[PDB]
Ligand binder design. Sequence first.
Ligand SMILES: [Zn+2]
Ligand SMILES: [Zn+2]
Ligand SMILES: [Zn+2]
Ligand SMILES: [Zn+2]
Ligand SMILES: [Zn+2]
Lengths: 346, 346
Amino acid sequence: MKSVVNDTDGIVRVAESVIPEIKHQDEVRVKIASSGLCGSDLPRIFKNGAHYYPITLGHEFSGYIDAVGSGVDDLHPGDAVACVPLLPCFTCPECLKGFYSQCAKYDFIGSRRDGGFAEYIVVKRKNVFALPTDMPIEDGAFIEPITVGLHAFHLAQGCENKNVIIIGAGTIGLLAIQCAVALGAKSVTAIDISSEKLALAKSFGAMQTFNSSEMSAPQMQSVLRELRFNQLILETAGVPQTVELAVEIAGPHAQLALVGTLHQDLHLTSATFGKILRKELTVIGSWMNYSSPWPGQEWETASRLLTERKLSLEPLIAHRGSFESFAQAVRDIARNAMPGKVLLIP
Amino acid sequence: MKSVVNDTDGIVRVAESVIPEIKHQDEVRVKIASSGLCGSDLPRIFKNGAHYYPITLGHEFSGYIDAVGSGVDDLHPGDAVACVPLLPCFTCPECLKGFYSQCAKYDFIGSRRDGGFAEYIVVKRKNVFALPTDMPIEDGAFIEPITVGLHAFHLAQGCENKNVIIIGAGTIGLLAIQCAVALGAKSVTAIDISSEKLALAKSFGAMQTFNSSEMSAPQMQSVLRELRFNQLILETAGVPQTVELAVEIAGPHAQLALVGTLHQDLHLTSATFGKILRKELTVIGSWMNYSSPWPGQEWETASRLLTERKLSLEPLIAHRGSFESFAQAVRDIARNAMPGKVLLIP
Ligand SMILES: [Zn+2]
Ligand SMILES: [Zn+2]
Ligand SMILES: [Zn+2]
Ligand SMILES: [Zn+2]
Ligand SMILES: [Zn+2]
């Protein structure tokens, strides 16, 4: 079988290996149908940011059950699933509190173990999430990235009647816009360094967009004056400038959910830091996308919003291809901006 | 009358001026009995931190009503009061929502206007808070700093049954320790560079202390393992190193309340920033100490805790003196650490 394997210093290869076998009663094998590249994968591929090399990435995927372990009674060959890539230990104090993303001993498909850029994969039963039978299987690869935004909304106690601001118009951000609209946000504003996805953002329901390469924070704050209360700002870009921006534009008692992980240091002036206090912001760290009961309401919500046609995935997709096509698309990224969702379609 | 007036390049003078007159029907004049120096005043004096110079500081004070304006019907000459130093406009959208500390046009006694390092001051009726008749007048000068900690607890939805960590053993911090104990915290831990102040913290009920000049963050986090859940951390020191320390030591889903204003920039590593997300911290900016109904439950609680003998003020006090003595004590501090509460007793 084929897979995409990344090695040190940005080399991408398509490799051949044996189909993995089920080794435990609680495992299943998935024949992968659709598998997406995450923004978080770019540092793993090009910036020697993976836990090990060689590695096969991929934690945003769907497919059909090919086989099940003898202890699996609620799934059958042919069933459609999405991958739930985190595997908590389920027995430490954090896990028993439902703090799965704080498990000290968790596995992660496509980061801590090999993942879904492959024709087949073997995972635990608890690492798959059954899809509605009428859901196009390709759509299943988007459930995991949908739940990222949903998890942040959940930590913020919802987005209903809030003035939502999404910073970063990558896939996670664009999905978050769609979810905010569907979940009853009063308004949604989208902010990004480029202007391309911003028209797209408006098509997804953002009522306005700010190009941060063309507007300063005070200019944005001025436009936001009427919408300054009950803000929920999601920082999805994961760069110092956008974390700073979020604090600078925030209205009184805004909630600021941090979704994007930084790869450079954050220097805040005393002035900017002071605004966190003066505005009495609530800054909410968000990590992964799970809650109790496992894998969490985020996953059910994502599935439901999709089935209800409240989300639109097609415009998000920049590339569809099998292994060679996908590998070259990944290579073509180098480390510039992500064009859109690059899908591997085995 | 005398007052303490500080000037550019850190000069502290004792000045003579005319007693202020009541000019409006809703003003009162207070003859000041006890007036404290805040940690926040040191940058105003020795670091070009004030809004203007020359300036008379002082926002932690008590005294007796000397005279009232024709429109004041509920206060009388001889009444004991503490100063409520913030004056919001009460007519902007922030104020109408009870967000007084985000008022777009607020005054502040001892920062934006001259304050209580003086024999007499004229303020609005809304700027005084009546004390119980049996409360020792000097105790009144501590109500405002008590409400600082209480306001942070309030924003965090209380400290009851929580594992409270107070970072900074200055007056604000030590008072917050006492309040946390009185309000039913599960545990209280104090962190500071001073073994002195930390012994005091233990005497106030802190079950353990960490000397940050001797212990590293990992060492502290190791000790905190048993108490890592349901943490509420108050950062009261207002220096970059203690904000960093707070994130580094925090347990899973800890609440971090930021009380201390920075007068230096904050440089967080990408790793430290990452911990905000990975631990799913909630970082709560806390600003001043007010809520609806004006001036807020914080003030009632402060008064009550004092009357109920749940707080201990004497050990907090490092100096009592009239104007020359007080002024020299302030000069002796410079940009060294605060010894404890320095009181002006006119
Ligand atoms: Zn991801
Ligand atoms: Zn665990
Ligand atoms: Zn103060
Ligand atoms: Zn106002
Ligand atoms: Zn720096």
